[PDB]
Design an enzyme around this catalytic site. Structure first.
Site, mmCIF file in Angstrom:
data_model
loop_
_atom_site.group_PDB
_atom_site.id
_atom_site.type_symbol
_atom_site.label_atom_id
_atom_site.label_comp_id
_atom_site.label_asym_id
_atom_site.label_seq_id
_atom_site.Cartn_x
_atom_site.Cartn_y
_atom_site.Cartn_z
ATOM 1 N N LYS E 162 12.428 -3.517 -187.651
ATOM 2 C CA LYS E 162 12.831 -4.440 -188.701
ATOM 3 C C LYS E 162 12.214 -4.065 -190.028
ATOM 4 C CE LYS E 162 11.152 -7.825 -186.690
ATOM 5 N NZ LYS E 162 11.126 -7.209 -185.369
ATOM 6 N N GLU E 188 2.805 -11.074 -191.905
ATOM 7 C CA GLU E 188 2.998 -9.672 -191.599
ATOM 8 C C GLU E 188 1.708 -8.897 -191.721
ATOM 9 O OE1 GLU E 188 5.356 -8.399 -190.179
ATOM 10 O OE2 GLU E 188 6.006 -10.474 -190.054
ATOM 11 N N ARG E 189 1.782 -7.631 -191.330
ATOM 12 C CA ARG E 189 0.650 -6.733 -191.442
ATOM 13 C C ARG E 189 0.268 -6.587 -192.893
ATOM 14 N NH1 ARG E 189 4.197 -4.430 -188.075
ATOM 15 N NH2 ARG E 189 3.547 -3.597 -186.053
HETATM 16 N N1 LIG Z 1 14.898 4.532 -188.959
HETATM 17 C C1 LIG Z 1 13.919 4.950 -188.151
HETATM 18 N N2 LIG Z 1 13.787 6.241 -187.854
HETATM 19 C C2 LIG Z 1 12.819 6.673 -187.044
HETATM 20 N N3 LIG Z 1 11.930 5.866 -186.461
HETATM 21 C C3 LIG Z 1 11.964 4.541 -186.670
HETATM 22 C C4 LIG Z 1 12.983 4.003 -187.552
HETATM 23 N N4 LIG Z 1 12.804 2.687 -187.589
HETATM 24 C C5 LIG Z 1 11.747 2.405 -186.807
HETATM 25 N N5 LIG Z 1 11.253 3.507 -186.259
HETATM 26 C C6 LIG Z 1 10.094 3.540 -185.364
HETATM 27 O O1 LIG Z 1 9.710 2.215 -185.032
HETATM 28 C C7 LIG Z 1 8.335 2.043 -185.307
HETATM 29 C C8 LIG Z 1 8.012 0.638 -185.745
HETATM 30 O O2 LIG Z 1 9.096 0.016 -186.394
HETATM 31 P P1 LIG Z 1 8.706 -1.242 -187.275
HETATM 32 O O3 LIG Z 1 9.621 -1.277 -188.447
HETATM 33 O O4 LIG Z 1 7.231 -1.157 -187.481
HETATM 34 O O5 LIG Z 1 9.043 -2.472 -186.315
HETATM 35 P P2 LIG Z 1 8.679 -3.973 -186.718
HETATM 36 O O6 LIG Z 1 9.584 -4.209 -187.873
HETATM 37 O O7 LIG Z 1 8.975 -4.763 -185.490
HETATM 38 O O8 LIG Z 1 7.232 -3.971 -187.078
HETATM 39 C C9 LIG Z 1 8.049 2.966 -186.449
HETATM 40 O O9 LIG Z 1 6.723 3.461 -186.341
HETATM 41 C C10 LIG Z 1 8.992 4.096 -186.213
HETATM 42 O O10 LIG Z 1 8.299 5.062 -185.440
HETATM 43 MG MG LIG Z 2 7.536 -5.314 -188.616
#
Ligand SMILES: Nc1ncnc2c1ncn2[C@@H]1O[C@H](COP(=O)(O)OP(=O)(O)O)[C@@H](O)[C@H]1O
Ligand SMILES: [Mg+2]
Ligand SMILES: Nc1ncnc2c1ncn2[C@@H]1O[C@H](COP(=O)(O)OP(=O)(O)OP(=O)(O)O)[C@@H](O)[C@H]1O
Ligand SMILES: Nc1ncnc2c1ncn2[C@@H]1O[C@H](COP(=O)(O)OP(=O)(O)O)[C@@H](O)[C@H]1O
Ligand SMILES: [Mg+2]
Ligand SMILES: [Mg+2]
Lengths: 179, 502, 53, 59, 478, 480, 70
Positions: E162, E188-189
């Site tokens: 997300k 959030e973080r």
């Molecule tokens: N478009 C993308 N391409 C490659 N890896 C992705 C992508 N989106 C997410 N990821 C993987 O998902 C991991 C975490 O996604 P994140 O956005 O942190 O999830 P959340 O939004 O739940 O925190 C990232 O470290 C990445 O490795």
């Molecule tokens: Mg997140």
């Protein structure tokens, strides 16, 4: 209403009614209310930490100076034994409402800016009585700057039922035009 | 816009003819106010459901009449209310000022217009919780209520005085089906109400705009309680709509009322009762959640000929979570209604639009709600389709299947192609009869499935233009007579030949 | 297309007509608010004679 | 629909004027009462009010 | 001469504040507990009156750490709801819940402040113009097209992407946009907030010098914040966004990460408040709390809010009360899947569960619509097939089914896209795919002109041209 | 009626009524509240004393709407439970919970009344004869045959045909039965309450020209009623059926529809009564409230009561407490399946899940019993094979397995039947099938003489002969 | 707020406060409902002991509590 504070007060009134000390008990209950107003006195009886044995000795001395009715002294002793001294204030206030019921008196409270003579009140107290259905009416007066020149009487079980005319005509007119 | 010169006459008018009647009025004291609910001390004369008015000017409803205090459910947010202020007992129990002038107006849950087009002229008044029509007061449902959806009006017919539920998942097409129905009653002389409980303000506005463009707002009332409003209003929004519909219903008019969703009503009533500390039930819904809908949806009836023969068709809409019909609120609303319409996202994505899962869709009125010409044609259509699916699923398990089964997989796949429709492309009952007559009698057993959609469209246009006598028989006699059938046959053959040439 | 585009332009023209009419009405309302002041004053006196007994 | 806007407008403005005007009148009335006969007229009104109350009670 | 109250109770972040009997603060007014520590004297504890309890005692939820408060401290009613600076000064600044700057720069102008508890725009003021809006993402521009000036939802559990997808949306949309963007970080973080803050500076959204021309505000109630502070960060961010639309009459982007946290903070405080819990542990007024925040976001005739808000979905369960309640409000949902992130298709947007209101032929034209159905008809058919294929495998299928499966597999891969933000993970440079390119590519796959190409030629390319160029390399290499 | 109490609380349907301290009503007495309407005219809303609460107040669940009731109104205790008029003048009238006639005809004679709460007959009384009766339904007569004088249950979720099946049964049995029938609708649609009453007129059971020559008594506690009312039309309709059983000594049909609403109604007010919730949200007294209601509905030496009662099953879950409690009571359960409904097989009576006590060879004879037993083994085999055939196709079966599958498929269709009531649903005219026709018809399918026929010759035909005729027509259509 | 404060009982208590007494013989029904009676009194009953009310019903004292015996 039927809550623990109300429940106890009703018992106290019923025993007085049986023994015909309703006037005599009521004076003592009014006398108690002055006693338990004080933050220090109420706190001593109410808190759990002070030993119960000490509480009785102090209570007995208080009763003697006060010269309370024999049941009324019991009633507080019963409260203390059964831990409900934390709600004495609610119980004492509750008794007054019960005491009016037993007699058949009804309070009314009548509000003016200007102090009024007994003759006006006599009509109102007779008027509240028939409208009430009362055996008797006891009148309570208060002084208010805010209304205009009239007053509002409140009566009923609670002070629920209020019939007034002073400010209210102005308010009604304000509403009326907008229609 | 000249105001000031008449104000000296206008101001006097307000004072003029003012009665200033004095009557006993119940009053009480506010103990607590928090988050939509007041706890009122006093008021030993209020009745369960009486509107009580706060000092600031808020109208609340006295639900719990406890022995100490009164649970009051505020219609709005009592930011202004102050502990100790005095609240009056009005005496009325939630009336609605209702009249003829609501048509074409978006109105509030308390029935005050929110489109900003002026105050409504309302002479009479009706209660919100009026009792439903009695058992002797009604009559059997016989009149059709046309949706223009061939999948509904052939297999799940909806009749006046009925209650058909529209149940599906989020974004499964439920609103579109309901809206289509209201748009389709353009010259059928019925009144439509669209109650929008808890729906997004922008979304409600979009629906109203769509109605206005079509010209459907000439007979539609839209009652809208948006998500932002107090739970009370959402909870009472459906009742207000019913009261409006009922007013027309008793004037011998026919009404259709859509409640969108009923699920967001019972969430708004779960919120009200949990904050009143009423003991909950399943999923923290109150015990009396079934009763809340049931009493509302049993208002929808077809009255007897003694009481004017007016009607009121309710169209609940209750969206289920990921196909979970086993949830507590969709369980309650299915068993109230006179049959459900399941919409499914699995059929919605696979092109089958409107996504009527006809296998689990039910019409408890049945073919009494269809006109005779249509009843004759599609009377056994509903069962055959269900039967056909059973062996469509089973003939994927056979390898070398005989022709007598292969005929039914031929015909049954043709019958499904009748039923699909483009959004907002309603069909006249004439256009539904000749469509079902064509598919049932095997006149599509020649051509390809892709061609079937095209062929029917060409055929319908043909009979609008060349043969207006078929329009005349089915619209007047309402019976698929031999003459009408003969006309349809002639036309089918001619159209088929033209199609073959093309 | 051509009819459709024409219709779209007609819709724009209608909006211009409607936009202008509302503005004219607002101006008229402002003038009225400025106008008929006596009603205001006398209007104020209005309630006064009937508001009370 | 734009015309309906004006219809409503003509109403809101009207109401506002009516109210504001009434409000002033109210102000003036208050002022005069504040000056009207304290024990004389005040007393008279009190009596009237009382009379009214009595009447209400009888009914 | 503001009335002074005394703390009667502290139960976590919930204060019971006793007042003189005539004067009670209204609900939603702020309180200022006078506060005390070992060194100094902060008035930093700020509250918000939630209830009136009787016996002249309000109940208030504190916006900070309540540690160090004594029963009996002085409390002043500020007489208004919790007002926040808005406007020109809020551009380029990071803010609290309380409107108090965080970024260690000069204090803001409190000339123009606004309350955070405001009623929504009324029904008259809304607009109904239905405009589509391009994000440069293939799953989004095709199967769930986004609304100009309406709420957008990004659904998914933990770690499905997300935050990354929002970062991509922020990256593509914000610089191009002519309207002030406002980010609100709710629960959030903090690392992400810091990371996000740097990106704005690097891309110039937050220019270091002449900060008043920055055209991004930032508002942070993060994971570390107490639960009373995470309830209102959303409102604070929303208030600022709403002011821009209302007074600067602009078009606003309101990114929120994560609105699930806003509901969850509300849920945590509700337990302290004593309200019975309606479902799971959720507060009874869940729809209303969610509704109040959501309703304010609507676009009016004076301006427009285009809010893209990520919504956490706990234990991948879309039937949870928090996620389920949110669905009604959004104009377009983008349900990210975990099963697509296990395979590595990124963005892991489940193309069948994501739905948009704008995917209608009078909004997107007949060309985009007849493809986006025909894409979803293929995937839907493929989804049905999977139960059978899971056991038997591919070989059994018929030739029609097999053809769709081959097409469906190619189609799923084509939807996957490299991101500009995701260069730090994979190293492959991201690709902005225009809507026209996306429609064209999908038509080819469905048509079959590209049936001879292998499937990994489609994986993580931008255009269809890229897939073709990529396809040759797999074949050429040998 | 000399005891006056004042209402103290109204929380929903549950009132709390404070009485003078010596004189308090017993449990299950009817309070009648001197309440007033919107006109101001006095209106009376009846209540039931559910429980004595202490502090000289009772807790009563009102039988009508509590909207408009005020704390403090006079409540007179009638000194008895709800007396419902019974007998001859209740026949062909339609009645309330309270026994007030609801069909706008002149008032029922109340010279005879009876309380609704009474004990069940003692163990001595119960009449043990086992007798089967013919219904005309192919699934019912063959596989789950009904017991004359026994409790009969129609189990199914929403929309499977509990109501339609009940209507069909009512039509056959009601006209034929010598004894007075009683329909009591506990918590159902008022549309179905109307559609019965005008169809009871058309069949001549109401006999609107000469009333009290009628043979049915209708009691209605529909969905719009408060939960106090839907708890008690199960008892009102039962009180009237007990009078025709006990006093007039004639055998009665008692069609209850729905029994779950009665169970459900108690649950709604149970929370308000202060009882802690039992498993699945129902009241803790579910198995007693069914037992109290169920025990009363039993045949005695004096008279015999046959009751066929529809039972809603929430979300098709036969483990739900309301449905589960009911199963012990019934002599024959007829469990409607949504799977056969969505296949189109109507009535969607699940033949493997429907049981009966009477299907025993001493009761039904060894010819009927072997065919009813062999039908279930053919359907049981097919059920087991369903998982395998879909995955492995029909061709992985043996000839023996294929034969049963072909037969089961044919048998499954055959059980379906067009009803007289469902002519608006089926579109084809209904058929009545005897026990003999069904056994004769089922025997042939099992025998295999009809293996050559197509399967659609069996769907929605009454007799076996009709199926053969349909097969001939289908072949003729196929040739063309 | 709790059982055994029925205001017969409190008054009985006030009258006999200066006393010693054991009510162990007989106990007075406080509330009846749903097949359960709560009884004030019965200080000497043991858990599981059959107790019989007026009009002949017999009950088992399953719950013994300070306020009353269920
Ligand atoms: N478009 C993308 N391409 C490659 N890896 C992705 C992508 N989106 C997410 N990821 C993987 O998902 C991991 C975490 O996604 P994140 O956005 O942190 O999830 P959340 O939004 O739940 O925190 C990232 O470290 C990445 O490795
Ligand atoms: Mg997140
Ligand atoms: N017959 C149809 N043909 C094509 N599209 C349709 C049809 N019916 C509905 N839709 C489309 O499905 C989309 C979602 O439909 P709609 O909003 O009407 O359903 P819904 O269940 O009310 O969704 P929500 O849960 O968001 O209210 C709409 O954009 C609509 O255009
Ligand atoms: N014998 C039948 N033939 C055709 N349809 C039936 C039959 N029984 C039930 N149905 C279908 O089921 C629908 C609902 O069944 P219903 O009788 O109302 O049962 P319930 O009370 O369980 O909902 C009917 O309206 C009809 O559509
Ligand atoms: Mg919708
Ligand atoms: Mg039924």
């Amino acid at each position: 209403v039927d809550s623990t504070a109300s429940r106890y007060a009703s018992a106290l009134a019923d025993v007085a009614d049986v023994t015909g000390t309703l006037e005599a008990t009521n004076s003592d209950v009014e006398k108690l209310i002055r006693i338990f107003s004080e933050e220090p006195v109420y706190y001593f009886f109410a808190n759990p930490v002070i030993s119960i044995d000490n509480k009785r000795s102090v209570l007995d001395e208080i009763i003697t100076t006060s010269g309370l009715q024999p049941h009324t002294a019991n009633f507080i002793n019963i409260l203390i034994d059964s831990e409900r001294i934390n709600l004495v204030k609610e119980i004492l206030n509750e008794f007054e409402d019960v005491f009016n019921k037993i007699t058949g008196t009804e309070v009314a409270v009548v509000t003016s800016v200007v102090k009024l003579e007994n003759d006006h009140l006599a009509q109102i107290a007779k008027g509240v009585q028939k409208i009430t259905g009362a055996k008797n009416v006891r009148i309570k007066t208060v002084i208010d700057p805010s209304l205009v020149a009239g007053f509002t009487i409140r009566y009923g079980n609670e002070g629920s039922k209020l019939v007034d005319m002073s400010v209210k005509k102005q308010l009604e007119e304000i509403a009326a035009q907008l229609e | 816009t000249i105001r000031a010169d008449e104000i000296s006459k206008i101001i006097r008018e307000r004072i003029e003819g003012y009665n200033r009647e004095v009557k006993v009025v119940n009053t009480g004291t506010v103990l607590q106010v928090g988050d939509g609910i007041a706890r009122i001390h006093g008021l030993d004369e209020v009745m369960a459901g009486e509107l009580v008015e706060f000092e600031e000017g808020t109208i609340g409803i006295a639900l719990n009449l406890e022995s100490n205090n009164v649970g009051v459910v505020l219609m709005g947010d009592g930011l202004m209310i102050q502990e100790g202020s005095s609240v009056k007992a009005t005496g009325r129990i939630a009336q609605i000022p209702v009249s003829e002038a609501y048509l074409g107006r978006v109105i509030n849950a308390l029935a005050k217009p929110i489109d900003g087009r002026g105050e409504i002229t309302a002479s009479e008044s009706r209660l919100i919780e009026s009792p439903a029509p009695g058992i002797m007061s009604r009559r059997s449902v016989y009149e059709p209520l046309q949706t223009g959806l061939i999948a509904i009006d052939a297999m799940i017919p909806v009749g006046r005085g009925q209650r058909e539920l529209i149940i599906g998942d989020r974004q499964t097409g439920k609103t579109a089906v309901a809206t289509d129905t209201i748009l389709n009653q353009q010259g059928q002389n019925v009144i439509c109400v669209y109650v929008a409980i808890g729906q997004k303000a922008s979304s409600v506005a979009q629906v109203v705009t769509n109605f206005q463009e079509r010209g459907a707002m000439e007979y539609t009332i839209v009652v809208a309680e948006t998500a932002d409003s107090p739970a009370t209003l959402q909870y009472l929004a459906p009742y207000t709509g019913a009261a409006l519909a009922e007013y027309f219903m008793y004037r011998e008019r026919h009404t259709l009322i859509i409640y969108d969703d009923l699920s967001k009503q019972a969430q708004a009533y779960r919120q009200m009762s949990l904050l009143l500390r009423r003991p909950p039930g399943r999923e923290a819904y109150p015990g009396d959640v079934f009763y809340l809908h049931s009493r509302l949806l049993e208002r929808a009836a077809k009255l007897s000929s003694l009481l004017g023969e007016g009607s009121m068709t309710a169209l609940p809409i209750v969206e289920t979570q990921a196909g979970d019909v086993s949830a507590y609120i969709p369980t309650n609303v299915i068993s109230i209604t006179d049959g459900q319409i399941f919409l499914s996202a699995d059929l919605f994505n696979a092109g089958i639009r409107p996504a009527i899962n006809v296998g689990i869709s039910v019409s408890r009125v049945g073919s009494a709600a269809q006109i005779k010409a249509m009843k004759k044609v599609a009377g056994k259509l509903k069962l055959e389709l269900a039967q056909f699916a059973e062996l469509e699923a089973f003939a994927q398990f056979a390898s070398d299947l005989d022709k007598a089964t292969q005929n039914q997989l031929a015909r049954g796949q043709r019958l499904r192609e009748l039923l699909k429709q483009p959004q907002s492309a309603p069909l006249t009952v004439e256009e539904q009869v000749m469509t079902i007559y064509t598919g049932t009698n095997g006149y599509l057993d020649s051509l390809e499935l892709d061609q079937v959609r095209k062929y029917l469209v060409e055929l319908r246009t043909y009979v609008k233009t060349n043969k207006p006598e078929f329009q005349e028989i089915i619209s007047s006699t309402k019976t698929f007579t031999e003459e009408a059938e003969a006309l349809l046959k002639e036309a089918i053959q001619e159209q088929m030949e033209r199609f073959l040439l093309q | 297309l051509e009819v459709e585009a024409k219709l779209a332009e007609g819709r724009k023209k209608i909006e211009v007509e409607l936009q202008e009419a509302l503005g004219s009405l607002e101006q008229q309302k402002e003038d009225t608010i400025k106008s008929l002041d006596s009603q205001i004053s006398a209007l104020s006196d209005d309630i006064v004679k009937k508001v009370l007994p | 629909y734009k015309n309906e806007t004006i219809q409503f407008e003509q109403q809101k403005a009207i109401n506002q004027v009516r109210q504001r005007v009434f409000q002033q009148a109210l102000q003036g009335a208050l002022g005069t009462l504040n000056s009207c006969l304290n024990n004389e007229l005040h007393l008279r009104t009190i009596n009237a009010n009382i009379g009214m109350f009595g009447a209400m009670n009888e009914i | 001469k503001k009335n002074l109250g005394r703390i009667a109770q502290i139960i976590g972040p919930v204060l019971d504040v006793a007042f003189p009997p005539g004067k009670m603060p209204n609900i939603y007014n702020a309180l200022i507990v006078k506060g005390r520590d070992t060194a100094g004297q902060p008035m930093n504890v700020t509250c918000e009156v939630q209830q009136l309890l009787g016996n002249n005692r309000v109940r208030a939820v504190a916006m900070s750490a309540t540690d160090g408060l004594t029963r009996g401290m002085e409390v002043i009613d500020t007489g208004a709801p919790l007002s926040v600076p808005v406007g020109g000064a809020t551009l380029g600044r990071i803010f609290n819940v309380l409107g108090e700057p965080v970024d260690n720069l000069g204090p803001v102008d409190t000339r123009t402040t606004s309350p955070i508890h405001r009623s929504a725009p009324a029904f008259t003021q809304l607009d109904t113009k239905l405009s589509i809006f391009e994000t440069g993402i293939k799953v989004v521009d095709l199967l769930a097209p986004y609304r100009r000036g309406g709420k957008i939802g990004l659904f998914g559990g933990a770690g499905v992407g997300k935050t990354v997808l929002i970062m991509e949306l922020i990256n593509n949309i914000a610089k191009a946009h002519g309207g002030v963007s406002v980010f609100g970080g709710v629960g959030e973080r903090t690392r992400e907030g810091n990371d996000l803050y740097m990106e704005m500076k690097e891309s110039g959204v937050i220019n270091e010098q002449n900060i008043a021309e920055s055209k991004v505000a930032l508002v942070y109630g993060q994971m570390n914040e107490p639960p009373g502070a995470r309830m209102r960060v959303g409102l604070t961010a929303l208030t600022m966004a709403e002011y821009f639309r209302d007074v600067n009459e602009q078009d606003v982007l309101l990114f929120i990460d994560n609105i699930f946290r806003f509901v969850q903070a509300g849920s945590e405080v509700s337990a302290l408040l004593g309200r019975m819990p309606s479902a799971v542990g959720y507060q009874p007024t869940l729809s209303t709390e969610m509704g109040s925040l959501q309703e304010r976001i609507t676009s009016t005739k004076e301006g427009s809010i285009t809010s893209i808000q990520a919504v956490y979905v706990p234990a991948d369960d879309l039937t949870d009360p928090a996620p389920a309640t949110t669905f009604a409000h959004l104009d377009a949902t983008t349900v990210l899947s975990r099963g697509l992130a296990a395979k590595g298709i990124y963005p892991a947007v489940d193309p069948l569960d994501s739905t948009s209101t704008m995917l209608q032929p009078r909004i997107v034209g007949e060309e985009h619509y007849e493809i986006a159905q025909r894409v979803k008809e293929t995937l839907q058919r493929y989804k049905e097939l999977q139960d059978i294929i899971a056991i038997l495998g591919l070989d059994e299928l018929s030739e029609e089914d097999r053809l769709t499966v081959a097409r469906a597999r190619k189609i799923e891969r084509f939807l996957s896209q490299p991101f500009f933000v995701a260069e730090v993970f994979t190293g492959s440079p991201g690709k902005y795919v225009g809507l026209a390119e996306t429609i064209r590519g999908f038509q080819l796959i469905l048509s079959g002109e590209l049936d001879s190409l292998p499937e990994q030629a489609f994986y993580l390319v931008g255009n269809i041209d890229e897939a073709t160029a990529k396809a040759m390399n797999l074949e050429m290499e040998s």
